[PDB]
Amino acid sequence: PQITLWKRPLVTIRIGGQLKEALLDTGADDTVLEEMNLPGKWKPKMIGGIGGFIKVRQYDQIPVEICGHKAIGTVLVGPTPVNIIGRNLLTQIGCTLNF
Amino acid sequence: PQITLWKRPLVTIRIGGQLKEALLDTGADDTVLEEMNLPGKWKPKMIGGIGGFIKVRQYDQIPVEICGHKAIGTVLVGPTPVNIIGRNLLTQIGCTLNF
Ligand SMILES: COc1ccc(S(=O)(=O)N(CC(C)C)C[C@@H](O)[C@H](Cc2ccccc2)NC(=O)O[C@H]2CO[C@H]3OCC[C@H]32)cc1
């Protein structure tokens, strides 16, 4: 769909069987979600944002549905102010910026 | 134009006659630029993201040129690692997310 930006681009995603709200974030290389229970092995990792670094758990080849569109990729779980969908998953669902 | 997200959506912007690279960021509510000299009064402010908060200076009605498109809005200047063009200016150049 065509999404304008007068409002935050929040969409419903389905991950690990549950529905959650996430922000389509083109300024994010990675996808990071608030703490949650996800099956599978995970590896500790570190990522930084505008205010510093945080510790996250990294889950690979995770299935995620964004507004109906399927994606399978890396998801980082940790202390983020909001669930963010980064370019690693945005490219999988064919999302582009237009103007 | 149409920007793919294989790479960071880095674009050239013009401000005060000077050019620079900035990120077209749908996850950013406001626009944040790297420390720079700007004339005009400002208002103290703190913005937060992954890792915590940073102190920035808020300037209003600043004119920026992104890809030949003009936009006028508020910009926050602070110790950010990347120049960020947020939704406050993105909406003015008629930028949309599509998938
Ligand atoms: C009021 O105005 C604001 C403007 C901007 C922000 S923000 O920068 O914390 N933010 C975070 C978003 C969830 C709000 C926007 C994201 O797109 C923000 C932009 C950014 C900041 C620093 C370095 C590179 C990229 N991206 C971000 O934190 O991405 C994370 C996840 O993937 C990684 O790639 C780049 C850094 C890492 C916060 C407030």
TrEMBL record, chains A, B:
The way this protein sits in the membrane is described as:
Lipid-anchor
What's in the keyword line of the UniProt record? Aspartyl protease, Host endosome, Hydrolase, Protease
> Example GO biological process term?
proteolysis
Q: Name one GO cellular component term.
A: virion membrane
Q: Where is the Peptidase A2 domain?
A: 20-89
InterPro entries, sorted:
Aspartic_peptidase_AS (IPR001969), Peptidase_A2_cat (IPR001995), Peptidase_aspartic_dom_sf (IPR021109), Retropepsin-like_cat_dom (IPR034170), Retropepsins (IPR018061)
**Protease among the record's keywords?**
yes
Q: Which SUPFAM superfamilies match?
A: Acid proteases
**Where the protein is mainly located, per its record?**
host cell
Q: Which PROSITE patterns match?
A: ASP_PROT_RETROV, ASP_PROTEASE
Q: Which GO terms describe its molecular function?
A: aspartic-type endopeptidase activity
Q: Record keywords: Chloroplast included?
A: no
Report the superkingdom from the record: Viruses
The cellular location(s) given in this protein's UniProt record come to: Host endosome, Host multivesicular body; Virion membrane
* Short name of one Pfam family: RVP
Question: What is this protein identified as?
Answer: Protease
Q: Which species is the source of this protein? A: Human immunodeficiency virus type 1
